[PDB]
Amino acid sequence: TIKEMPQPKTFGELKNLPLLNTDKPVQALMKIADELGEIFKFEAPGRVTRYLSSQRLIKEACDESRFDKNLSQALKFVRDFAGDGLFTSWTHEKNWKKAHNILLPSFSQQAMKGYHAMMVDIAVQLVQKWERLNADEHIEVPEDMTRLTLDTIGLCGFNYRFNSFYRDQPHPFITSMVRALDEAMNKLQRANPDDPAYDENKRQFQEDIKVMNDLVDKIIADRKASGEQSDDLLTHMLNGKDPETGEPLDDENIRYQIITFLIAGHETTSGLLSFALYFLVKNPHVLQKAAEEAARVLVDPVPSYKQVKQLKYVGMVLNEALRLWPTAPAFSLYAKEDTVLGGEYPLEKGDELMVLIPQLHRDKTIWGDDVEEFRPERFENPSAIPQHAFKPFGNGQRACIGQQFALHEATLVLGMMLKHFDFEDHTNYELDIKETLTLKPEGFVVKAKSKKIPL
Numbered sequence: 131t132i133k134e135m136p137q138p139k140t141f142g143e144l145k146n147l148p149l150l151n152t153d154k155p156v157q158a159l160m161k162i163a164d165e166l167g168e169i170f171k172f173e174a175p176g177r178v179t180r181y182l183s184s185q186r187l188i189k190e191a192c193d194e195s196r197f198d199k200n201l202s203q204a205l206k207f208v209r210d211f212a213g214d215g216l217f218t219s220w221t222h223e224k225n226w227k228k229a230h231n232i233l234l235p236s237f238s239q240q241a242m243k244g245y246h247a248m249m250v251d252i253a254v255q256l257v258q259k260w261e262r263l264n265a266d267e268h269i270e271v272p273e274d275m276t277r278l279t280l281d282t283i284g285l286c287g288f289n290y291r292f293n294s295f296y297r298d299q300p301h302p303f304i305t306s307m308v309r310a311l312d313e314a315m316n317k318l319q320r321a322n323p324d325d326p327a328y329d330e331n332k333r334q335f336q337e338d339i340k341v342m343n344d345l346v347d348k349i350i351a352d353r354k355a356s357g358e359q360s361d362d363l364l365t366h367m368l369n370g371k372d373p374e375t376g377e378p379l380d381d382e383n384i385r386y387q388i389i390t391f392l393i394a395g396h397e398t399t400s401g402l403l404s405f406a407l408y409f410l411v412k413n414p415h416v417l418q419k420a421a422e423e424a425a426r427v428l429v430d431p432v433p434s435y436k437q438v439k440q441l442k443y444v445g446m447v448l449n450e451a452l453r454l455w456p457t458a459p460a461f462s463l464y465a466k467e468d469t470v471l472g473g474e475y476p477l478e479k480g481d482e483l484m485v486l487i488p489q490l491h492r493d494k495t496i497w498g499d500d501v502e503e504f505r506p507e508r509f510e511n512p513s514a515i516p517q518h519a520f521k522p523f524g525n526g527q528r529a530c531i532g533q534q535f536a537l538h539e540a541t542l543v544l545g546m547m548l549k550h551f552d553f554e555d556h557t558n559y560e561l562d563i564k565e566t567l568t569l570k571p572e573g574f575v576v577k578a579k580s581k582k583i584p585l
């Protein structure tokens with residue numbers, strides 16, 4: 131039985147476009163989904179998309195025989211500097227499958243043993259920073275988690291030290307990367323982008339792209355010249371051959387992969403740690419259980435690879451933070467052919483869907499009535515979760531290549547944080563979620579009291 135799709139309020143000839151004229155568009159779309167339900171049409175001059183929020187429909191959207199990854203306008207704007215790297219390439223572009231085949235073994239769970247020592251290097255810098263704070267001082271949580279995640283991907287990725295724990299001002303590459311990401315996201319709600327009023331934006335955008343290309347191209351050239359085999363992603367990309375084509379990646383594509391990894395490993399990854407610590411300080415019984423596990427498992431001055439794998443409750447804490455506030459909160463699909471979604475919604479070839487991940491993760495038919503409660507134990511029996519209910523890393527062959535890397539990093543540093551410190555929500559922090567490329571708890575601060583356990 132073919133059904134008419136709900137649609138939020140319109141603004142005459144602008145249709146729904148002004149609803150995304152807001153600094154919190156994901157949260158705005160979540161409130162629309164609360165009102166309209168599992169699917170709604172969103173129209174703007176010259177475009178239509180459909181926002182999905184239910185496991186019932188998203189399980190069908192996740193069928194790779196019917197739907198492929200679409201580049202959202204967000205991704206198309208980011209492609210001006212991430213090029214045909216893995217994140218901003220179409221599945222049908224030669225460089226997508228070549229890079230996928232070359233890089234997948236470098237990102238496997240087994241590959242994490244090789245990155246572990248470098249991850250420990252940066253995690254120990256974070257612990258030392260907090261051990262060295264004076265009594266009257268607090269922690270700026272997203273700021274420090276971003277120092278950790280950026281430095282970890284730079285060191286593990288390219289053997290490059292951003293030295294974020296030695297700085298107040300971002301590294302110049304990061305200044306340019308953040309300003310380019312801001313400009314990409316600002317262009318989403320910029321009417322009349324060719325207005326000469328935006329000439330200075332365009333000049334600054336080009337300058338920022340040049341900064342990024344110059345440093346990354348120089349790192350690649352320097353590595354090729356030295357012949358150093360540093361067993362990092364860059365070594366793996368210079369040496370690796372796609373089994374299918376038999377070709378390696380070219381230097382330009384390697385640059386795009388590095389820029390892509392640095393984007394993803396910045397606030398997108400540090401957001402998970404920031405939300406996890408937010409939920410732990412707001413749920414003291416959960417924090418106590420996580421801290422008990424950290425003390426029981428992390429018996430050595432430095433965590434081992436196997437000990438991080440042992441932090442099962444810490445893993446469930448991270449999955450429960452990804453459930454409520456997934457930090458890459460949407461992805462886009464297109465219909466490969468004419469098809470009917472959920473027996474009710476006919477789609478034509480090319481028709482676009484958006485998956486609103488935070489709303490999927492609040493589907494009471496999956497999670498039950500308590501969907502707003504932070505309860506890591508809901509991940510104790512993962513075989514009981516229906517297909518495609520939990521999608522913080524996207525879908526299928528276009529799922530996050532960084533999933534094992536991100537969860538290993540996050541589990542290691544959260545375990546060390548819980549072993550080494552007691553935490554205080556000293557301001558009774560009121561959650562304020564800032565939306566950029568990603569989501570973060572803006573202004574989240576805590577005090578950490580050392581347990582005085584040596585490293």
Ligand SMILES: CC(C)C1=CC2=CC[C@@H]3[C@](C)(CCC[C@@]3(C)C(=O)N[C@@H](Cc3c[nH]c4ccccc34)C(=O)O)[C@H]2CC1
Nearest residue numbers: 150155156202203204205208318319458460461484566567
């Ligand atoms: C780069 C990666 C990490 C991101 C992916 C994203 C996907 C969906 C985005 C996003 C969350 C930013 C806010 C807009 C939103 C929700 C979106 O639906 N956007 C649609 C619809 C849209 C909004 N404004 C537009 C202007 C023109 C065309 C389309 C649009 C889109 O981008 O396509 C955004 C965050 C950044």
